[PDB]
Amino acid sequence: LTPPVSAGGIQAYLLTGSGAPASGLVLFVVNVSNIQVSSSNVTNVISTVVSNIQINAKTENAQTGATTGSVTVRFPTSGYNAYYDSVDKVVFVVVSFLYPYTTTSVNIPLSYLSKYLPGLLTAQPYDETGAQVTSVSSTPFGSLIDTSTGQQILGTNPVLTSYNSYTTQANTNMQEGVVSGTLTSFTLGGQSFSGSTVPVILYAPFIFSNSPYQAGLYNPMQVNGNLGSLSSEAYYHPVIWGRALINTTLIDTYASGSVPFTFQLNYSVPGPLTINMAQLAWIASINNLPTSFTYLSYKFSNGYESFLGIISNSTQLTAGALTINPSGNFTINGKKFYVYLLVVGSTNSTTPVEYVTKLVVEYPSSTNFLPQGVTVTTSSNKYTLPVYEIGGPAGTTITLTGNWYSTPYTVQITVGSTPTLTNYVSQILLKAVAYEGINVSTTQSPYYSTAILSTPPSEISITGSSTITAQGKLTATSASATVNLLTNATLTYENIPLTQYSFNGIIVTPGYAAINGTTAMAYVIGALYNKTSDYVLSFAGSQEPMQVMNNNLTEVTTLAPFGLTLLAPSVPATETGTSPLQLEFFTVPSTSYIALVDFGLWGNLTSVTVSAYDTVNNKLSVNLGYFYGIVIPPSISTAPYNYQNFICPNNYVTVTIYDPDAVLDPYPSGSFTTSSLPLKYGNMNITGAVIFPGSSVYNPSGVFGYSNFNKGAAVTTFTYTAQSGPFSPVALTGNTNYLSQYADNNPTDNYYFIQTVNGMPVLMGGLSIVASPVSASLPSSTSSPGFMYLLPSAAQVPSPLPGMATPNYNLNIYITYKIDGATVGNNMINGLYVASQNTLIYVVPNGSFVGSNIKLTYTTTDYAVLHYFYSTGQYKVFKTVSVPNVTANLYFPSSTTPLYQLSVPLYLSEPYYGSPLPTYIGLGTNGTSLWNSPNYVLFGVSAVQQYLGFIKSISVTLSNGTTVVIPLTTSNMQTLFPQLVGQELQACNGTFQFGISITGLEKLLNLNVQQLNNSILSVTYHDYVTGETLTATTKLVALS
């Protein structure tokens, strides 16, 4: 039992799961293990306990939590059912609250109940009245006594009426039922009883939860105070960036165990957008093409080429020695027409260049002028039509001859020198819809908690409405016309005779950078001029969206046709007309985020509505969830550093990068993957994205929701692993072809996620480092994605939601010289290194330390930031860390020093020599200074003997003004310095102490003991680290 029931306490549990007898059953238990019970007194103990139970029954509005009716009830003195189990030592009662068993009792098999009361398989329960029995019967709710009244609960009472009617009540009125119990405190057999149950929910509708989060979704990072102004409104206006997960909670009382949920997301922007569109192909009857023109086919991002489509009555097109066979045929009321599809390019070719897979031509019906359509097929009735190439060197001309009806026509193409691109630019009221699925489980029914993507890598349908308009001149024998569509696309008709058709039309594709040629839409418009009572020129047009895959341009669906009619009773006339027109583009999966940024549907003004479906039970949400879109630029900063940040092994410099758009998963160290499939939603099967938590990428099969669904072997598993070399880097391992299906929180690999087309990422984002004067860089040309395991910091305990991510990334930088030239196996320590999770180490030679520097550049990971801030440059940020110069010093303790004393200390000081104790500087030869530091270690590498300076000269200037310069030799030093080593005095304070010895100095000069030696002593030292030459002096004194 979860939760447990205390000594003499009361608790309640809902009967659920497989084999559960009916809905709306709750089990109450009181713990009676605290005393002995026997066949002699069992009737008295159950009677005593069940007398003291009180039950409270409520109805509520499921969104707001407002109470809408409440009753409180007590068991009668006879006619109830209550039991005792000897094995588990508990008294129990089952109450039935909901239809149909509100007034009548229901029977619960003892096999089932053993889940909660396992003792029941060991011995049969005691009944009331002391018997034992094999089966349990509910006490019905409609039998209990109203404590308000002292009588049986009324049949007319609103709570009982509601519970008896719950199916339509929950759906229509958003009603929820809630029940709880308590035991009025009493003493029995020398023990005492007291308590109150947890409440339980009997029924509730399928909704997004709206308390405390009023919108049904939330972003943890905004609820905690981390986004500035935006934290004022986190409970009713959630914001999220393009590729990340947003958290949500659903209430579901139909569910048991795990459930697949499918979701539908609708995107919208205030007011119309300006869209840029390129012409993929041009289709016309041979009468409508101009007599002479210049053309060369454009080549799109996916390799597809623009084509020119001629329709004619002739069984071939003829061009001298070359003849072209038709790609396909169609018939209209017994007349037969042929379609020729051509690419103008390099050389006349007899094999297919590429294909078009279904193609609808629309025409006005002869009877009624309503639209009708036919699909063009090959001469053996297969649907895929081939496209041919004609061409030659630039300025070569090709004449094609064909027929329209009875009349021969010639067209004269000149092979252009540069690709013909036609751009149309229009204003359209765009919107888009997308679909997504996840598998969710819970330990706290009926609450299902989960997170869903901001933008899924599914097919996404971008959709919008526009206008077509026609103008026309009609006459006794022929008619002439023009049409406009997509703001500035124009089509024209050569004069159409009475009873004859003519065709024209265009196929268009998005004119943006990465995605062009991957999706298209086709309009083919036929015209007919005929005499009735009135003269009628009629137009009919197809509308079909298409996609390119493996060089077939293929039909996705057909939308409805459209039609326009111009009517004249007068013989000569001019007329005009209009119709609505529709536009639809289906994205190919990898392109889906780029499309939404490019068209303008994703940005600071966008708003999204979400609905949800349970795939086990076939239910839809009775409310909708809401969220809003945001784009935020990066920023870089550093904590203030002096020279002290570079002395001893525990000192370092901290750089903080702020970039919320790099946090795709609200949990730090979290991971997920994604794949595309058909999903069940409503009563239909629709292409969508399925999210899998973890670090393995899958190629699934079947339809998500049904029992076909099978995710196969893991195609690739990504992991961060330790590696060889010094220190030990942690870096990403796994097949890089699949990074466009993996999400983490690391900016050194997050830039691939839904931003990779043709196998190359659109934005080379992340962190880049350069170092000087020892030239090094990361990433190097050979370096993989994920060269270090950089992750964001977690929100701490005073925050409302701890352990969740923060937009700050903290990077630690160390610069040092003490371990330069160390070796770790085969490795030589010099240059720039990654260490641990968030650490960089730079090791440089002694002579290059002051002035050494690192320059860090951070570029955004998200394509929306690159797009909206390209011009201003706010998508990159830079910082540089460098080692400052410091003032060293050498000094005898006092200006005057007495000759009486045998040794007079000379102290050297320079901050950058400091280390943990002990450390010492040795002297010898021509005054060479050697530094040793045995206790120094940095990430496992330990310090090496360094050569850091020299004593340059030592001199005495005597009382007659003569100056003596003492030559440094292996013999002279040992007298002047009796110990050849100077020790450091305290930890990390570089101040070394040496014993220049007067007793030695006398003998080394042979100068008269004191009588000559009212003199100035001098010493000088050069250090390589700073470059300074220090000097110190003292007047040697005695009575003179």
Ligand SMILES: *[C@@H]1O[C@H](CO)[C@@H](O[C@@H]2O[C@H](CO[C@H]3O[C@H](CO)[C@@H](O)[C@H](O)[C@@H]3O)[C@@H](O[C@H]3O[C@H](CO)[C@@H](O)[C@H](O)[C@@H]3O)[C@H](O[C@@H]3O[C@H](CS(=O)(=O)O)[C@@H](O[C@@H]4O[C@H](CO)[C@@H](O)[C@H](O)[C@H]4O)[C@H](O)[C@H]3O)[C@H]2NC(C)=O)[C@H](O)[C@H]1NC(C)=O
């Ligand atoms: C989408 O909308 C987002 C939310 O507003 C925008 O994010 C914000 O970006 C600002 C910088 O970019 C702005 O400036 C460029 C041109 O230079 C233009 O593209 C836009 O104008 C764009 O908004 C940045 O705001 C700062 O610059 C503003 C200049 O326009 C200025 O008005 C602000 O006052 C800021 O100086 C935001 O960065 C945050 O700014 C807030 C200030 S406030 O909340 O905006 O008032 C800081 O909060 C403050 O923190 C200090 C701590 O010391 C407190 O003392 C103080 O009480 C508190 O207000 C944040 O620290 C700072 O990060 C940035 N907002 C967020 C969410 O970080 C985004 O650019 C819009 N996108 C587009 C497409 O433009």
Ligand SMILES: *[C@@H]1O[C@H](CO)[C@@H](O[C@@H]2O[C@H](CO[C@H]3O[C@H](CO)[C@@H](O)[C@H](O)[C@@H]3O)[C@@H](O[C@H]3O[C@H](CO)[C@@H](O)[C@H](O)[C@@H]3O)[C@H](O[C@@H]3O[C@H](CS(=O)(=O)O)[C@@H](O[C@@H]4O[C@H](CO)[C@@H](O)[C@H](O)[C@H]4O)[C@H](O)[C@H]3O)[C@H]2NC(C)=O)[C@H](O)[C@H]1NC(C)=O
């Ligand atoms: C694809 O296949 C196409 C169909 O056969 C070829 O088209 C033909 O192109 C000819 C030019 O191609 C030649 O030159 C290029 C270099 O630019 C080479 O790469 C080719 O190998 C080839 O040698 C074109 O001829 C015209 O241009 C010539 C320039 O070299 C020159 O002879 C004349 O200036 C030509 O006008 C064909 O166009 C037709 O040519 C005939 C004559 S002929 O067939 O060339 O002998 C003309 O008839 C003449 O009309 C004049 C009117 O002034 C009369 O005075 C004369 O009595 C009469 O003969 C036609 O008017 C003219 O249209 C052209 N054929 C057609 C009809 O399309 C193409 O080369 C192939 N591409 C490749 C290289 O694969």
Ligand SMILES: *[C@@H]1O[C@H](CO)[C@@H](O[C@@H]2O[C@H](CO[C@H]3O[C@H](CO)[C@@H](O)[C@H](O)[C@@H]3O)[C@@H](O[C@H]3O[C@H](CO)[C@@H](O)[C@H](O)[C@@H]3O)[C@H](O[C@@H]3O[C@H](CS(=O)(=O)O)[C@@H](O[C@@H]4O[C@H](CO)[C@@H](O)[C@H](O)[C@H]4O)[C@H](O)[C@H]3O)[C@H]2NC(C)=O)[C@H](O)[C@H]1NC(C)=O
């Ligand atoms: C907002 O929504 C986020 C959805 O992305 C939620 O993130 C998920 O967080 C889980 C832990 O959160 C718990 O603790 C926080 C406090 O930090 C509480 O606020 C939460 O209420 C909750 O109690 C996290 O679960 C994992 O970590 C747990 C340790 O805390 C551990 O007990 C679990 O067993 C999990 O490992 C989710 O992280 C991922 O979890 C999946 C498994 S599952 O989704 O939990 O079932 C792991 O996948 C597995 O990986 C192993 C590899 O060992 C494979 O063998 C196995 O095949 C595969 O299933 C992931 O590796 C692991 O990262 C985390 N979900 C994701 C996808 O990141 C977040 O909590 C929500 N916020 C709130 C406030 O509720």
Ligand SMILES: *[C@@H]1O[C@H](CO)[C@@H](O[C@@H]2O[C@H](CO[C@H]3O[C@H](CO)[C@@H](O)[C@H](O)[C@@H]3O)[C@@H](O[C@H]3O[C@H](CO)[C@@H](O)[C@H](O)[C@@H]3O)[C@H](O[C@@H]3O[C@H](CS(=O)(=O)O)[C@@H](O)[C@H](O)[C@H]3O)[C@H]2NC(C)=O)[C@H](O)[C@H]1NC(C)=O
């Ligand atoms: C383009 O011309 C093609 C011929 O060059 C046409 O292909 C022939 O289509 C026949 C009729 O089917 C078509 O009905 C409409 C006509 O355009 C149109 O909606 C569709 O294109 C639709 O496919 C087709 O016959 C069908 O019915 C036969 C019953 O007699 C049956 O035997 C076939 O299996 C088929 O379903 C032709 O197939 C040929 O049928 C021959 C018998 S007969 O139809 O000549 O009486 C028989 O020898 C053999 O089965 C088969 O060769 C088919 N003809 C050829 C040569 O493949 C095509 O429809 C035109 N396209 C359009 C759209 O106009």
Ligand SMILES: *[C@@H]1O[C@H](CO)[C@@H](O[C@@H]2O[C@H](CO[C@H]3O[C@H](CO)[C@@H](O)[C@H](O)[C@@H]3O)[C@@H](O[C@H]3O[C@H](CO)[C@@H](O)[C@H](O)[C@@H]3O)[C@H](O[C@@H]3O[C@H](CS(=O)(=O)O)[C@@H](O)[C@H](O)[C@H]3O)[C@H]2NC(C)=O)[C@H](O)[C@H]1NC(C)=O
């Ligand atoms: C369809 O797909 C193609 C593939 O992605 C596009 O070709 C690439 O276009 C780049 C810029 O795109 C913009 O300008 C086009 C006109 O030049 C325009 O048609 C697009 O709609 C879009 O607005 C093009 O960059 C060139 O043009 C820039 C002017 O905007 C100019 O600044 C550049 O110097 C360059 O001349 C790509 O060429 C590539 O440029 C790379 C730098 S970047 O400009 O992309 O940042 C450079 O690293 C690379 O070496 C170079 O090749 C060009 N890419 C290729 C592979 O050719 C094509 O334009 C799209 N066409 C349509 C119908 O819009």
Ligand SMILES: *[C@@H]1O[C@H](CO)[C@@H](O[C@@H]2O[C@H](CO[C@H]3O[C@H](CO)[C@@H](O)[C@H](O)[C@@H]3O)[C@@H](O[C@H]3O[C@H](CO)[C@@H](O)[C@H](O)[C@@H]3O)[C@H](O[C@@H]3O[C@H](CS(=O)(=O)O)[C@@H](O)[C@H](O)[C@H]3O)[C@H]2NC(C)=O)[C@H](O)[C@H]1NC(C)=O
């Ligand atoms: C690093 O190590 C050095 C070891 O040589 C330290 O030098 C010693 O510093 C003492 C005072 O330091 C304090 O005041 C500084 C400003 O004056 C300040 O920058 C420091 O950060 C620190 O706050 C100095 O003591 C003098 O002042 C005392 C009162 O404050 C006075 O009591 C002493 O008699 C003296 O006047 C030391 O001076 C020498 O002291 C010898 C006695 S003892 O101090 O060892 O007990 C005495 O026999 C001698 O005659 C006198 O010269 C001084 N040591 C030396 C050899 O000069 C230094 O502060 C450390 N720096 C840091 C930043 O850690």
Ligand SMILES: *[C@@H]1O[C@H](CO)[C@@H](O[C@@H]2O[C@H](CO[C@H]3O[C@H](CO)[C@@H](O)[C@H](O)[C@@H]3O)[C@@H](O)[C@H](O[C@@H]3O[C@H](CS(=O)(=O)O)[C@@H](O)[C@H](O)[C@H]3O)[C@H]2NC(C)=O)[C@H](O)[C@H]1NC(C)=O
């Ligand atoms: C397109 O131009 C072609 C040229 O090849 C021409 O073909 C002619 O076909 C008719 C049959 O007409 C039937 O089909 C068409 C649709 O294909 C329908 O519109 C009609 O209602 C009919 O059902 C043949 O009668 C022609 O055969 C030729 O006759 C020539 C003399 S002619 O004076 O009769 O034209 C002879 O020289 C040829 O030997 C013989 O093959 C045929 N015409 C030609 C010259 O091949 C159609 O007229 C044109 N179709 C349309 C849509 O107008």
Ligand SMILES: *[C@@H]1O[C@H](CO)[C@@H](O[C@@H]2O[C@H](CO[C@H]3O[C@H](CO)[C@@H](O)[C@H](O)[C@@H]3O)[C@@H](O)[C@H](O[C@@H]3O[C@H](CS(=O)(=O)O)[C@@H](O)[C@H](O)[C@H]3O)[C@H]2NC(C)=O)[C@H](O)[C@H]1NC(C)=O
């Ligand atoms: C720290 O950096 C200083 C300055 O760059 C460097 O001084 C250079 O000293 C070498 C000799 O040092 C060698 O022996 C000692 C043993 O005492 C070892 O500890 C060292 O590891 C070395 O093996 C001298 O060769 C340099 O003097 C000048 O060299 C020039 C050429 S260079 O390429 O070697 O620099 C000549 O052209 C000049 O004529 C000559 O004066 C000296 N460098 C300079 C420019 O003064 C130390 O070795 C470094 N200390 C350590 C241990 O890193």
Ligand SMILES: *[C@@H]1O[C@H](CO)[C@@H](O[C@@H]2O[C@H](CO[C@H]3O[C@H](CO)[C@@H](O)[C@H](O)[C@@H]3O)[C@@H](O[C@H]3O[C@H](CO)[C@@H](O)[C@H](O)[C@@H]3O)[C@H](O)[C@H]2NC(C)=O)[C@H](O)[C@H]1NC(C)=O
């Ligand atoms: C300042 O007073 C000093 C003490 O009297 C003198 O310098 C010392 O005297 C040493 C020897 O006497 C004379 O030699 C120097 C140099 O040759 C002469 O310039 C003066 O006449 C000195 O009095 C002297 O030793 C040096 O010279 C001798 C040879 O005479 C050599 O054997 C030695 O190797 C050495 O080169 C030194 O200059 C100094 N000795 C000591 C112990 O310090 C001198 O009177 C005057 N200084 C000078 C040199 O003018």
Ligand SMILES: *[C@@H]1O[C@H](CO)[C@@H](O[C@@H]2O[C@H](CO[C@H]3O[C@H](CO)[C@@H](O)[C@H](O)[C@@H]3O)[C@@H](O)[C@H](O)[C@H]2NC(C)=O)[C@H](O)[C@H]1NC(C)=O
């Ligand atoms: C668009 O044209 C495509 C030609 O590359 C074609 O894809 C190939 O289909 C074959 C099996 O289909 C047969 O029929 C087609 C008729 O279009 C033939 O072109 C093809 O050679 C086959 O005989 C299959 O092996 C594979 O999916 C494709 N072949 C390659 C190159 O891998 C499509 O059938 C066509 N339209 C679509 C997508 O339906």
Ligand SMILES: *[C@@H]1O[C@H](CO)[C@@H](O[C@@H]2O[C@H](CO)[C@@H](O)[C@H](O)[C@H]2NC(C)=O)[C@H](O)[C@H]1NC(C)=O
């Ligand atoms: C019910 O019956 C048993 C006797 O069958 C009671 O147990 C005795 O209680 C007394 C004091 O209450 C103890 O001193 C004895 O140890 C018990 N005797 C036996 C035979 O076990 C039990 O307490 C009774 N329960 C109630 C609530 O009356």
